[PDB]
Amino acid sequence: VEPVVVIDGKGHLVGRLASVVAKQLLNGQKIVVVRAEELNISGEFFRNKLKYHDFLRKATAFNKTRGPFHFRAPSRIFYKALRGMVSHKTARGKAALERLKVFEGIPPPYDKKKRVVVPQALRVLRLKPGRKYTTLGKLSTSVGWKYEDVVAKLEAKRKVSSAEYYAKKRAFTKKVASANATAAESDVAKQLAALGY
Amino acid sequence: LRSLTTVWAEHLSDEVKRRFYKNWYKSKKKAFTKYSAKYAQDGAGIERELARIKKYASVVRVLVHTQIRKTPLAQKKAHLAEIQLNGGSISEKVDWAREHFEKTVAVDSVFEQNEMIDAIAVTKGHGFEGVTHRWGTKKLPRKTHRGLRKVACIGAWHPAHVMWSVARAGQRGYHSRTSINHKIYRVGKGDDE
Amino acid sequence: TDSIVKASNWRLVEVGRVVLIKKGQSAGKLAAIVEIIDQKKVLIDGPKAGVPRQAINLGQVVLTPLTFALPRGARTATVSKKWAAAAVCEKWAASSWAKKIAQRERRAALTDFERFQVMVLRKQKRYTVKKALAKA
Amino acid sequence: MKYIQTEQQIEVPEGVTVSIKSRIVKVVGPRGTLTKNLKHIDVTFTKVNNQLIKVAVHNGGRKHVAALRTVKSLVDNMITGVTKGYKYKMRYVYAHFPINVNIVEKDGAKFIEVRNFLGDKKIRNVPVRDGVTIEFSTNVKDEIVLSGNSVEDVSQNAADLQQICRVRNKDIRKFLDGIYVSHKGFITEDL
Amino acid sequence: MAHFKEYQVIGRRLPTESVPEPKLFRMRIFASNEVIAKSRYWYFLQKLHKVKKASGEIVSINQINEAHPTKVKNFGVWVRYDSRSGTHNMYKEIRDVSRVAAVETLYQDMAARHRARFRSIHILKVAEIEKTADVKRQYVKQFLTKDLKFPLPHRVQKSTKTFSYKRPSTFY
Amino acid sequence: AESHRLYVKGKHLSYQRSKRVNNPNVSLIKIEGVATPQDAQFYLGKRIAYVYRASKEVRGSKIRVMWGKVTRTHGNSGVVRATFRNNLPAKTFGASVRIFLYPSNI
RNA sequence: GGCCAGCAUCAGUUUUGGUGGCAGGAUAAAUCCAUAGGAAUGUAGCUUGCCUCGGUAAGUAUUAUAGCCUGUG
RNA sequence: AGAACUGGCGAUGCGGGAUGAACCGAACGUAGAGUUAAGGUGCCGGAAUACACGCUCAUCAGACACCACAAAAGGUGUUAG
RNA sequence: UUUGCUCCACACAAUAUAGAUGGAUACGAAUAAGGCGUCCUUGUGGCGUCGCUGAACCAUAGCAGGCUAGCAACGGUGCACUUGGCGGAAAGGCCUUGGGUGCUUGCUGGCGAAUUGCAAUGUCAUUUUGCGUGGGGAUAAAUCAUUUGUAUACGACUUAGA
């Protein structure tokens, strides 16, 4: 529909975000996902922590280097859920995956490019209210990830600049609305009403 | 952590310059000769580099090197290295550095008597070493055929692979070590019989 | 220094709440909640709109802010008489909701030519507004 | 089975005003002010009048409803804590070694410092929590008093101390040594 | 087992010389079609009479339609069922708008709460509870308090497209 | 003007297939804005062009086209099956495709 | 008339829509109308009792200043 | 380990059961179109993140015949009797 | 080593392409709550309004968009300049000044279009490189061999040499 779709990870459910991202890729839709630290997994924090240490024990007995790799970063956790849903040892699969980019925080280009959401993987729209769940950022830091603080800091900085951008814009469209107003009740205006505008 | 700029002194001792090269004698020794220019124009460009460090930068390191000529060594090409600065604020840090360009610093300004210090260095080298001396493995009995400074069993039958955790002949020494808690018993001065 | 407690102010399932039917043969049509069966099923009726008295799943309907006085379990005739009494139709019709509905039904009906006209008309509007939004 | 609604009443008295947006509760009265986050629950608060606030659950299960009452109590205990306030008392208890208890300060600290427990050469240090003030009761033997606006902080500071004086490797039926909470009540007298 | 209709089924033992005009017995049967319904009939008759279908005939089969399909009704329901380790009688109350609707949710419920498939149940009786206050199970009584009203918090709109540009709101 | 498009955007997705066996003779097409089989009935018979590029010029062009037709709908979400003059290459699963408006019935 | 196509009219197979006429049943059951009787999750009225000038509540009260249920047609 | 009747495998690919001699489905000339079986339809993967009523929260939940195991006995978890 | 290198410019040649074909159109936070407007005592404030999907918003007419004239406006927008400022998370992009110049479908005119023959993507994008041209700019080093021994099985390492 658009050449690149930027998804705001926050408030999404890992494997349901994963399931739709894999699909879009396979159909040729480039995707970039942001704020993966604000991703969710259902089930309370301890469970997913336990689940992750289950992951941690798996390694190649003769050489831990050739064995399964344990990426700690919230984006790489996410990529894992994704890669798992893509026939990734085929050329078609590799291709699909290049269409993907995953980030912690919203770094440049993407901080000034719009981001969308994916309602069928929105936590607040899927999980029964009451059910315990888990923020990726917190799950990651507890298994080694080093950069929550510096993402948090950068984000807070970024969030200041974007509230300005916003404030300006909302101020510019108060005028713009104060325009669509004189123009109201005019011939061209009610003519456009007639045709549904 | 990522580096975003380096600002250099205007004049650089041949010693460090020698470090930037693999065939000094044949070279035209052109290192930093255009950079050295940058100072010329009032300073403008060097300033904004110091300026930018100050604006950003969560940490500051200095670029120092050794006066190897003041040393009996033959080796003549000096050693260059980054030292974190740990005094005051970021700005105060760079100011300090800028001020100390081409200027000189001594141990008494960083170590004192009885201080506990660590030492980072590369371990003496020994070349290809059999398993006995390299891991402190048992000498196998005198009666054993095909030699006895060995490990008798290199693994069970499964995993059917030699494992990363058994001892094997190979390079010994010429390793990095970071060895700690060495007390300074003396800080000597050279101009001091 | 009064207390001040938010609120949160939901449309209620109740006798006399008007609802918009979203799925089905009816669909787009309004109706009234007559009686009430459990947390998930209610009995609806909408004579003015031609929708048959029926039990329906709440999930197929969307509650509207409109309500009118109905006796619980009032039959179809009685329902028609209170509905008209309270002129719920024009009330609905007055609403931004229904208006937004009607608008896109209209947009949907535009001839290709009519569309071309709409574009010409927007160029036109854009010209005088871009002016206004530019002087002050 | 899902009850369609149960609700609770939260009485409000002449001194205080309580304001709740989202589910961020703030009760303010004479003895200061307390705020508490209830976002982890899902209830619906409603002002009926300056002395009354209802709290309700729609279409809730057992565990949900179960939680509804404890919401009522928490905000109650905030209101009281902000009118009457709380006062927990504890007594030192020992069979031979006088338990010596004082207040120290390291870098604007305030700590409860326990010496000589059961002879122990070690020195114990419970932090004074912010909100809670600690006074060694005059006219009473080996009594310590912890008062404040927050039942939670006062009670918790209490138990931190009583736990700092657990006995190990002894029959704790025989070695009953410790500091134990001995009266739970209010600050403002008469009531 | 499906979407039920309710049938009257009438049957009798075949006639004989010394007994023409055998007695004629009727059952109300809830089933999705007349084939299942005539089968259920013989099933139950063979638990009551010396008959089988090989020596009897169905006399009449007739679908019974709800008398007031848009009047809400409180149903008393009596059921016999089989569990894994024993067989058991139960009384449930169901509130819907037709016996047919009532029986559909029962079988559902029996399946969900007790893991009883269709083979394991016997409707013993389904009857409209006339006056309230003979309504006995609370999960229903709840719904007959005067001037009853309730919200449906946390509204969940269905998306029609995979990407949204807003961020939903569960208001209602 | 700025747009000149006279076709509907679309995407080569799969060949017709089993879990473990595909059939190159039938291609599966997702059409922009078609969500249901009812919606997709409009396009049955419309003609598809997969337009691609090449290094060798041919009949004076470096652009080539594989032509096909939409033949039936597919599943519940407005996907469509199509056959082509020559089966589509399969490096093109996920490549764009053009669904024209002819043969027309409006 | 070699190669490859487009449209039209047909034939074989098949898929997917729109629309017309009928048959059956409790000659569907409902709604609706008419009528008889009833009750409460009791509408008006009334009583008494608190109560910021009429609002609540607990009585009475079966169509009244809402309605519903059941049978028969 | 040994018998009875049938049906298979052996001698046989094909679709399903991830995988597999024997299970389910279905038996084979070269092909086009259609419809299905058993089995599936979040993504890997063709096919509803379909509809509907319930139940279930597990600091070692559970997840589909053959089949790749769990029992006595307990619970004031929760559900309906 | 027969005139090499680099940035800007255009010209020709070649080679590609995981797949342009109006526009990736920027708060944050909550969801048992929010957005927007407005007032105020500036707050967990009063009052209004909105949702129930982007089915939107914006753009969109002109030989794939030709050549021309005028009016009403002083607005819009492309381009290249120039003014002041911002952005280091991968900033490499955003905002602001000023004159110039083009276009304007805001409205009204003149001319052109056919024969591509009833469809044939009917070719209008962006990769990398190669050869010359002339406008700026810049004029190294590494390796072998020799040599040290803080190194070494051999390579490698570490030194030294106008």
Ligand SMILES: [Mg+2]
């Ligand atoms: Mg730089």
Ligand SMILES: [Mg+2]
């Ligand atoms: Mg040796």
Ligand SMILES: [Mg+2]
């Ligand atoms: Mg040893």
Ligand SMILES: [Mg+2]
């Ligand atoms: Mg040793």
Ligand SMILES: [Mg+2]
């Ligand atoms: Mg050994």
Ligand SMILES: [Mg+2]
């Ligand atoms: Mg020997």
Ligand SMILES: [Mg+2]
């Ligand atoms: Mg013990």
Ligand SMILES: [Mg+2]
């Ligand atoms: Mg002992």
Ligand SMILES: [Mg+2]
């Ligand atoms: Mg009946």
Ligand SMILES: [Mg+2]
């Ligand atoms: Mg041909």
Ligand SMILES: [Mg+2]
């Ligand atoms: Mg035909």
Ligand SMILES: [Mg+2]
């Ligand atoms: Mg018909």
Ligand SMILES: [Mg+2]
């Ligand atoms: Mg009424």
Ligand SMILES: [Mg+2]
């Ligand atoms: Mg009647």
Ligand SMILES: [Mg+2]
């Ligand atoms: Mg068999």
Ligand SMILES: [Mg+2]
């Ligand atoms: Mg054999």
